Amino acid sequence: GTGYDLSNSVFSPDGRNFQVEYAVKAVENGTTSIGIKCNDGVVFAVEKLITSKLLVPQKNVKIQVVDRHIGCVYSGLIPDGRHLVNRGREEAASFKKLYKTPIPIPAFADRLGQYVQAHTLYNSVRPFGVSTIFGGVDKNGAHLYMLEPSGSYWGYKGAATGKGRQSAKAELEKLVDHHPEGLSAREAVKQAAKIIYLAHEDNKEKDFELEISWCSLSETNGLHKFVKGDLLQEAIDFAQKEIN
Amino acid sequence: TQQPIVTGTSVISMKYDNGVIIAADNLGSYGSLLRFNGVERLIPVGDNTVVGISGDISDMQHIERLLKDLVTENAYDNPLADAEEALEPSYIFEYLATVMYQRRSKMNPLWNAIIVAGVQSNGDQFLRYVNLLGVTYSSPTLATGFGAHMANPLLRKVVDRESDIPKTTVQVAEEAIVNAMRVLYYRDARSSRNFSLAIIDKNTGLTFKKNLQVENMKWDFAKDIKGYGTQKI
User: Fold this and answer.
1) What residue segments make up the domains of chain A, in order of their start?
2) Exposure pattern of B3-23 as b/e (b: 16+ CB <10 Å)?
């Protein structure tokens, strides 16, 4: 028959949920965001399209902090990403309250995944429209995860989602091949700036602003912090050199 | 909480020309038993606020967790958590005071007396008090329990009015605080010789001194006390 793509949680004769795939398309329509796991932490980066010079630069932050050690950046429908980040913050607060210890990165990943999978379980709720790359440093070291609107989430050496996800994935594969020992935190920041600058060329019609955060056991003592000032400009210059 | 179990004794605090000083003993009393030592009752929040809690230690730990959660929540989606949009002492106070008055009104209070001391963004000295009843008052000198009875006269001899705050130096205020701690150790059965002391100066910042001890105690005259009246040997 027909009509399997009009209601959420409805399995097509193939075994698919078409509304989830449409949400994935909505994600693919979003900007490019990447995460890079280094030897002692993770680095998140995102492109912010400067639709007009009326936008206040360095403001309109896109990377959200969870607890004090988790970083999250979502590609797709930004409001849905904020909803998911708020839910994750509530989950982290609950975990810390009950077990005192801060929530581990895998636990947080599974919480977000179960939330999204529940959102893919009823025809009364729309699937999420954001792919979220998140992670941080816990007692077991660095962790980088990516979660899709289907509720599927995995741990990554490097992850990327958005319009320029393919070029970013190729550059991340190059980085993984050329660095088996692992990247350093600042090297990961420079590579994230480079990959963001390289993926902007797909939509070079309008100028963009780079936003980078990192959580490193040595560089930030395990806390999620926004890369700003001298390091951000250094990464921007590194990328500008790398393009040409 | 309807009856305190593990209790924290007095807390003292005063204002001086460039900020505030607060102090409290490190004793957790299980009623009449001096059960726990090294119990820090001064909780720093940021680089401009110290909260001194006296009373039920369980509710004190609850307030510790609440302050940590408040810091974490103020960090959320706030790129200015390091500057203009950081937790001011007045914010932390007003929040704690709202919580205390609510807990009172629900007939399940937090058996505590809290003194919030810090320096605002503009440099002004903030010193205020709340309790299980939600009563709020602010004075150049503030103390809880036996502190309010014994330390307050000594500390007010230094700063009786607001006009005495600009004249009072950090050394004078710290010496007065130490003398008040010694007097409390003299005449408070639930006091401790070990205490902690925080100084919030609008210039120097937050100085937190732990493991301090009461020194220069006068006990020699006890050798001459004999009997209770007519006895001589």
Assistant:
1) 1-244
2) ebebbbbbbbbbbbbbbbbbb
Interface of A to B at Cβ within 8 Å reads 59, 61, 64-65, 67-68, 89, 93, 97, 226
- The CATH code of the domain that includes B106 is 3.60.20.10
Q: Domain A1-244 maps to which CATH number in 3.60.20.10, 3.30.1380.10, 3.40.50.300, 3.30.300.30? A: 3.60.20.10
Contact B79 A97 (CB under 8 A): no
Exposed, middle or buried by CB within 10 Å (0-12, 13-18, 19+), for B207?
A: middle
Residue B43 dihedral angles phi and psi, to the nearest 5°:
-110, 110
Nearest CA in chain A to B80: A59
Q: What are phi and psi for residue B22, nearest 5 degrees?
A: -135, 155
Sign of CA dihedral A168, A109, A217, A86: positive
Amino acid at site B74: N
Rounded CA-CA distance B145/B151 in Å is 10
- Indicate the resolution in Å: 3.4
Q: CA angle, corner B74, sides to B71 and B75, nearest 5? A: 85
Cα angle, residue A131 at apex, residues A130 and A137 outer, rounded to 5°: 125
Compute the distance between CA of residue B205 and CA of residue B50 in angstroms, rounded to an integer.
12
- Count of the separate structural domains present in chain B: 1
Give how far the C-alpha of residue A95 lies from the chain's centroid of Cα atoms, to the nearest Å. Answer: 22
Taking each helix axis from N to C end, the angle separating B89-105 and B57-75, rounded to the nearest 10 degrees, works out to 130
